[PDB]
Each structure stands twice: as C-alpha cells, then as structure tokens.
C-alpha cells in the first residue's frame, strides 16, 4: 500500500544545487511520528544515511553533510524535498527516499517503540551524476587475439570503448549473432571525467582464420555508432 | 558516528544452505537494529526490524537476534532470490548508520582465471595514448589481485579494473584491468606485465609481452 518515488535531475554540474523530491502514497506525513528519510548509495559502495524529517517537522542530517543539506516537507502534497548545495562528483550516487513508521499507538497513545526501528519502505531510487564533462562519443579500439591471448584451443579478443560521456553505451558482437562467451564489463570513470569499458569474447582459436568478429558500439547520447572488426596481430601466419 | 561492522564481507553458499551474518556495533544500540536485502539494480528491502521482529510479508526463513552490540541475521534455507547483498542499520543514535554490507553469491568449485594480455592498438598509439589490457577469465571465488609491472616498476594510480556479475551459468567472474600511459611513456619501456593472485593459483601468475623484442 505504501509507494515512494524519487524525482530530480539525472545530471548536475559541480557547485550547483541538487533538489530531489520524494512523492509518496499509502501514508500521510500527518501520521503520528512518521518519518521520511534519504539514503544514498555511491557506485559500488554501501548505503549511506543522509537525513530524515518527521511528521512534527523535527529533522536531522548526517553531521558531515549538515552544512550542505536541507530537508523539507509539504504534508498536503505527500512530498518531501532534499536540497544539497555545492555538489561535487563525490556526490554521484543513487539516492533513495524511505518511510519510517511512527510508534505503535493505542487510541492515540504511543505505547511501543518497536515498529520505528527500520525504514520499512524504500523508493525505486534515482541515480544522479555530478560532472562537468561535455557529451563525447567513444573511440573504439581492437583487443587483438594473439599467442598471449590464447589458451589451448580458446582465444580471447575484444573491443576497448574509450573516453565517452555520459553513460550508457551498448555493445553487441556480429550484430547480436554472437553472444556465447561474450563479456561486456561495467564502465569505469576515468580521472579525466570520461568513461571507458571493454567487451571481450572467447572463441575457438581455429576460427581466428575464417570467422569474422565485429563489435557494434552504440552511444545514443552523442548519436555515435561504430562497427569495429577485430582481427589477429600480423605476427600470425 | 556509531560504527557498525558486518561480517563476513563476502560469503558463498548454495541453495538450501543455512547462513548467518553478524553485525557488531561500536557500542550499545539496544534493539534498534534493522536488516535489509538488496538485489542488483534494486532498492533495499526490509527483512528484520527492531533486531528480531519479522517484517510482515517476509518469508519465515528469515530471522534475527541480538540486543546491545552483537546481532545476527539468519536464513534457515537459502533460496535463489536470496543471493544478494545484506545490510544492517542502527537507528538508536543519530546519524543512523549502515554496516558495510555482506554479498552472498552462488558457490562452486574453485577455478583459477585464464589470464590474457593485450598490448595497445596501433590505432590508439597513433592518437597519443597507450592502454594495456589484462583479462582474467571465468574464475572463482571473486577475490583476485592484479598488479601492473613495467620493466619491474610497480604501477600505481594509472590503472582501473572492472568485474562482471557472477555468471548465471558457470557461476564464475571475469575481470578486466586497464593500464593507461601516454604514447611517449609507453615507448620508453620494454616489458609490460600483469601479475595475478587468486585462490585457484598455486603461485602468482605473470602474463606479459616484451615490446622491445620482435
């Protein structure tokens, strides 16, 4: 019965102000002692508590982010807003809002703490990236098969999709005809602010002579599409 | 802030197994401790609240215990939808804090990685940069260490790695490590190697090429 949804910009520039909105249904901020909190999850890391506001307008912030955070509510709109000032790329993360039950009450009287010890319903989450990098399509380089990328009868080859922004980019091999043995890695964010990923595929070495291998790269954000054929090093017969 | 220490950080198990995760607090938080389950690409889901209370609608296989500074989460019978990451959270002190999490993956027989190395492409070298790639294919468990050596010099701060999700078929992982240098720097050296350490390897494995030997 309780549903929460975060809304806001997916991309913000360093030093700007990020405003996130939590819209919910199934409860009212007028419910005694109810709370709505915000938790962030930076890429590949643990959950991080940010702030919470209650039905009585009481509120708290993570002490290390207290100067940059402000939490508010509008009980007639079923919304809670979190404002974060002077953001930096360190703030890139998926932000979630969540409901916190008020205490058990009997005909109005608060009689038990128990239920409040947890955030029982979380929103879907909104991924926000903070960067000043401009849109840029990737350069696609071949990861050529050779004796150093061959194990017995199995050879590895691939494509290096380098320097692009923003996410995401999709990769297929031979127009999707080849999927068995394929491994497309999650992108990594470079110090330059640009992303890079590699896609590889293990195949029989006895096919490196006839079979053709092409990686299809698509970066919609920049309207860039590239087909890169990957062939063995010339050091091979 | 109150510190929560989850353990183990990583755990491998099989369907039908019985697992237990613990969370230790830097100090007493009474019974104000909750447990959540988080599937990849999804938000956390409440399992246990107030240390041992079962959230309505949550399978009976989940149970929690503890009060004070020691807490445990137990899954009587591991189910396929249970391979995920679990977190504890204390709500006794502000700021509310979470543990570091515990990832649970499908276990299998150890499998050393096949290590492949790829020198940079003439195409990239022409653009001014040189990226060297080291690939660790289909290994298990997930823990692995890769070090870059250029003419015996340990490279630090100029390489990044990426790891795939556990394979839905063979339950293995694959890792890619990219070392990037400028064309100029790349041409000043001969031997490029990536050293690999893994439980499935009796000894560290070295894969390399000598661009100065043709």
């Amino acid at each position: 019965r309780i549903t929460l949804k975060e809304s806001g910009p997916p991309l913000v520039k360093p030093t700007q102000t990020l405003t996130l909105t939590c819209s919910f249904s199934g409860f009212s901020l007028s419910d005694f002692g109810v709370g709505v909190g915000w938790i962030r999850q930076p890429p590949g890391k643990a959950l991080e508590w940010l702030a919470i506001i209650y039905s009585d307008d009481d509120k708290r912030y993570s002490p290390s982010l207290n100067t940059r955070l402000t939490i508010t509510k509008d009980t007639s709109k079923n919304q809670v807003v979190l404002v974060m000032t002077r953001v930096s790329p360190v703030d890139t993360a998926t932000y979630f809002c969540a409901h916190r039950r008020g205490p058990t009450t009997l005909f109005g009287v608060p009689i038990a703490r128990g239920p409040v010890n947890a955030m029982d319903v979380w929103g879907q989450g909104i991924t926000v990236t903070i960067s000043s990098t401009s849109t840029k399509g990737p350069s696609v380089f071949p990861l050529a098969p050779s004796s150093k990328s061959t194990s017995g009868g199995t050879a590895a080859l691939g494509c290096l999709v380098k320097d692009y922004f923003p996410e995401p980019v999709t990769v297929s091999w031979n127009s999707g005809a080849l999927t068995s043995g394929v491994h497309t890695f999650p992108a990594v964010l470079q110090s330059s602010g640009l992303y890079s990923l590699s896609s590889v595929v293990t195949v029989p070495s006895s096919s490196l002579g006839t079979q053709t291998y092409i990686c299809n790269v698509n970066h919609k954000p920049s309207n860039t599409k590239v087909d890169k054929k990957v062939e063995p090093k010339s050091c091979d017969k | 802030a109150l510190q929560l220490t989850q353990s183990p950080s990583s755990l491998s198990a099989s369907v039908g197994d019985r697992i237990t995760i613990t969370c230790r607090a830097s100090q007493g938080v009474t019974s104000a401790l909750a447990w959540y389950r988080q599937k990849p690409g999804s938000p956390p889901q409440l399992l246990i609240y107030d240390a041992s209370s079962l959230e309505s609608g949550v399978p009976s296989r989940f149970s929690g215990s503890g009060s004070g500074t020691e807490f445990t989460l137990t899954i009587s019978t591991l189910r396929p939808e249970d391979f995920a990451t679990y977190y504890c959270q204390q709500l006794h002190f502000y700021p509310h804090t979470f543990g570091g999490g515990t990832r649970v993956d499908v276990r299998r027989t150890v499998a050393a990685p096949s290590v492949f190395i790829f020198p940079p492409s003439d195409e990239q070298l022409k653009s001014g940069t040189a990226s060297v790639v080291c690939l660790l294919n289909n290994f298990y468990p997930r823990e692995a260490k890769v070090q870059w050596k250029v003419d015996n010099a340990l490279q630090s701060g100029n390489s990044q790695e990426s790891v795939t999700e556990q394979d839905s078929k063979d339950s293995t992982y694959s890792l890619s490590s990219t070392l990037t240098l400028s064309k100029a720097d790349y041409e000043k050296h001969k031997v490029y190697a990536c050293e690999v350490t893994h439980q499935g390897l009796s000894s560290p494995v070295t894969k390399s090429f000598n661009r100065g030997e043709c």
């Binding site: 002692g33 038990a112 | 802030a1 009474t30 006794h92 002190f93």
Partner: peptide, 11 residues
Amino acid sequence: LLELDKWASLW
C-alpha cells in the same frame, strides 16, 4: 557524544 534517536527514550 552521540545524540539519541527521536524514539530512544520510548518503551
């Protein structure tokens, strides 16, 4: 010194 949660004093 850590501040107590809003409900830390409730039974």
